Amino acid sequence: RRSLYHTRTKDLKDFIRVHRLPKALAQRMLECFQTTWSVNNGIDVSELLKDFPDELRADIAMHLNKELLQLPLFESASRGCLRSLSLIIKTSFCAPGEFLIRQGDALQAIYFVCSGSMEVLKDNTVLAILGKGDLIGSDSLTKEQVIKTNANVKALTYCDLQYISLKGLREVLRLYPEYAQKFVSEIQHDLTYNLREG
Template sequence: MWLEASFIEKPLRLEVAAAPKSRFILLHYSVPKALWDWLILFGTFYLAVTVPYNVSFTTADHTAIDAPLTFIADVVVELLFIADIVLNFRTTYVDKSGKVVYDPRSICIHYVITWFFVDLVAALPVDLLYAAHIPVSSFVHLLKTIRLLHFLRLFQKLERYSQYSALVLTLLMSVFTLLAHWMACIWYVIGRMEMANVKTWHNGWLFKLSEQQDMPFFNSTVGGPSMYSSYIAALYFSLRSLTSVGFGNISANTRAEKIFCICTMFVGALMYALVFGNVTIIIQRMYSRRSLYDTSMKDLKDFIRLHHLPEKLKNRMLEYFQSTWSVNSGIDVNELLHDFPDELRADIAMHRNRDILQLPVFAGASRGCQRSLSLHIKSSFCIPREYLIRQGDVLHAHYYVCSGSLEVLNDTTVLATSSQVKRREPVWG
């Protein structure tokens, strides 16, 4: 007898009153906004590489306009940050109560009191001053480093991608590489400062490097290794210091260089623990499913050995375990959905068992009845040549063949075959 549930044919649903939305408002969780955030992230990475290098290695008489490709890229990034300011004035946000705010006026006020002035300073078109041949000091050029504050905003948004281990691993290694790049730029600046000191210029690491490469300095400012060679040497030294791997071919000689090395070692120890500690966790997460499989297999073998199961029964258990694991990867659906509300679990069950509920035997059931039945339908997997029901067993359920085939045997004689070729057939006791 079917339980009629016509009174729930039209499910009750609590709906939040639709807030008036402008067609020009961009949702902060939408796909276009996510793609735009990634574009801003790449632009920020570009600035994180080029700005410290230009400040450290570019001489006073050399401007960005002398490198057309670099100049064009810098201008494009500046335009991206200006466009980002405009979009932030039209992008929704979540207030302290957890409500998504769509009101344009509230969005503008929230952005102005949070990140607007930082973004405004970060988007100053410094490179356009080069195009106008206006002399710009290094201090003004350093204002571009404020754009690196975009990392703080973007890393908060990247939390939604924390479940992607490969992506998090790539970002962590990128941050470590950026830190080494910044340390290399600072190391070169210290070397240039020591070269400007008449008392210590012959003891600095740049002077030692010039002797190794047979490219001597004619005085404290003329001659010496090229910018490219100096940067490679500085990057090699910073990576060596951050990873605590030293060979001594480039070392600190002056007081300022030794102080910087001490600071680099402290920073390297912190970053090594932070970055590579997270790398270890990510790698463990990537192989967590395999570790669970090995643990379950070990427990199963210990159980077999403890109870001295016969070889035939042992092989059946191992084959069933390996076959079911290949199907569901060890995921217990009932445990996974245990904490979900009944309404959501019913929708999920209706989707998972939609093929069974389309059978003619369920045609007369109302939707409410089907939703109730779907919560009690369970999937069962049998390995080949395994018995599902034996004669004399007490039946507690009806079985339907959803995949594969099933034979009805009388001793060794096949009486009937039920398969999933044309239709799903019930197996009755």
Template sequence: MHAVVFGNVTAIIQRMYARRSLYHTRMKDLKDFIRVHRLPQQLKQRMLEYFQTTWSVNNGIDANELLRDFPDELRADIAMHLHKDILQLPLFETASRGCLRALSLHIKTSFCAPGEYLLRQGDALQAHYFVCSGSLEVLKDNMVLAILGKGDLIGADLPGKDQVIKTNADVKALTYCDLQYVALRGLVEVLELYPEYCSKFMADIHQDLTFNLREGSEIEVGACLSPPPVQAPAPGDAG
């Protein structure tokens, strides 16, 4: 009995030290990279803070790498669980289970630190982003257009064939943010496989977006934020 107990404790301690050793190895590699390429201090600090924060969140585990060798059937079930928050959006209510399973394999996770830009104005939009936690602001010409928080969806209505969507504003993190995103290319592939849901998605995406990043849609945003015009009194109504 003593041998079993101490053996298990020893194994646990060894695993703890192995994880810590991996952290220090990767941190050393990162610092060596920074030194060899002579990165400026500000960029160096951003890289170190990002590495330390993401490690504290996922303990250095890359889910995509970990699940890569599993069969698609099992990966889809795991992905459905990992990404259940974004898949429960009203936008996906009418999608079949097969469609959701296919879509879940194209969903990835991302992380954004305070002050970092998720997107910059004029970038080619490549994904829809769902905010799992944290807050971001949408900026245009140093003016705040929107504040985004948990449960918000940002992206754009899908373009025509071979059309590139250019973002109409900057998206900047105010706090540490966890995000899930689905790449537009993967989304289009899934919609082509499920045409019965495609028309419904195309009709609903515009209204389900918290903020539409398509270039030109800022006109609609401005109209929503501007106060209604004051109607001048008709002649004879004064007094």
């Protein structure tokens, strides 16, 4: 599958190559890239299926069984709500020591671990170990504006993640207000770690 880090790296190299940037400058950029990278800040926000007709979108949704959406959190969502959600779910490989989230960043998505392990790190202290089936996010997803993260989350091994952007998620909930009220009341039962400052 795709990896955001690798996609973002190639795109960074393209940009250096198309503009004939000088070696030293390029070097500065590649090491600053890997020094400042997080999946959270580099998520894929495109939506390939948005303009497709409802019937063709339904037909696609039927072939998806996204692990993220299997959580108890979604038990009460209508079929129309689950289909929409399943069509905006993304995935990404993550490398050991690669930051999923950097403390103080604005949360851009909720993430689901399909495989691999990760550590929560606040300051220089490990707060938790995350693994297959764990949901990472925040409890106040539907306000909304900015949610400032209270810890770093770093892959410990090679990880396979799924996720939904807060933007896409909020757009969907707005079309299913009834489910949204339950979502607020239910997400915390399934939330393994909550990044909301405080």
